[PDB]
Amino acid sequence: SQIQFTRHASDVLLNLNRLRSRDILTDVVIVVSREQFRAHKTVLMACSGLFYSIFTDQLKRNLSVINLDPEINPEGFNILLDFMYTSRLNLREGNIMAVMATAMYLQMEHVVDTCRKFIKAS
Amino acid sequence: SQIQFTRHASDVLLNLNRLRSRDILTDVVIVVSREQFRAHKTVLMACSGLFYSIFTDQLKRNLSVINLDPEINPEGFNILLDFMYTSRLNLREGNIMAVMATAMYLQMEHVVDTCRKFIKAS
Numbered sequence A, B: 001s002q003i004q005f006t007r008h009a010s011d012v013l014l015n016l017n018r019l020r021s022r023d024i025l026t027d028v029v030i031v032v033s034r035e036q037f038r039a040h041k042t043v044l045m046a047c048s049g050l051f052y053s054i055f056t057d058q059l060k061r062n063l064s065v066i067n068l069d070p071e072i073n074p075e076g077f078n079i080l081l082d083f084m085y086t087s088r089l090n091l092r093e094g095n096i097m098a099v100m101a102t103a104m105y106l107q108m109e110h111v112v113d114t115c116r117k118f119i120k121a122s
């Protein structure tokens, strides 16, 4: 019965992305081959089954650097990181396969299913 | 021209609230009179001009405890903290004045304006 603020969640996410852009309170570096990306662990956990599984484990909770599998495409990862912080997914014919495979590795099932629909649409 | 995921931001916020409920990666305690509340600084900064101003300052960025003004009502604060993490604001005739005054202190202008509309509706 509470009052619903229909733009609040989008506003929060936008502000979290602004904090990331200024490196404010970021607490992890994700290394993907020759590239590095900083982020907030909480957002990663909220958006990815892989990062949720890593950081929920007290053994790994405090890691400040995560090295992803060497086969992961950094562009695919960057596209997905931007999606996590924006709700907008930059799928293109030239990147669909890299994005899909990266989303499978990151355990982002709804994104994977969207990639399958994109393939079906050709 | 990117694909928009219309529930993504709400899903992220829900998952951030789940992390708060499990005390995962919370990094501040807010003390309000005899009560304490743990939270993520990033969400606080995203939702409040007061917390944004505090934590953007490199002098205060790493504070782990914030003592709010002793006059702040803990119930009012709890209502607003829950709003930050849910997008739902529990306004009632019995709490409107405490919530409004607390939102003024927390520099949550859209909430303050909503409180004014609630008063206008009686």
Ligand SMILES: O=C(Cn1ccc2c(O)nc(NCC3CC3)nc21)Nc1ccncc1Cl
Residues within 6 Å of the ligand: A045, A046, A047, A048, A049, A050, A052, A053, A107, A108, A109, A110, B015, B016, B018, B019
């Ligand atoms: O749900 C998530 C992260 N997430 C986002 C998509 C996604 C996906 O497609 N698969 C998975 N598989 C892993 C697990 C356990 C559910 N996780 C995913 N995080 C979370 C869950 C509950 N409380 C707090 C948080 Cl942060």
Ligand SMILES: O=C(Cn1ccc2c(O)nc(NCC3CC3)nc21)Nc1ccncc1Cl
Residues within 6 Å of the ligand: A015, A016, A018, A019, B045, B046, B047, B048, B049, B050, B052, B053, B107, B108, B109, B110
């Ligand atoms: O905008 C915010 C937090 N917020 C939410 C409502 C609100 C409000 O009604 N007033 C204020 N006044 C303070 C300031 C400077 C704008 N802040 C507010 N945070 C933010 C801004 C830009 N980049 C990252 C983040 Cl996290």
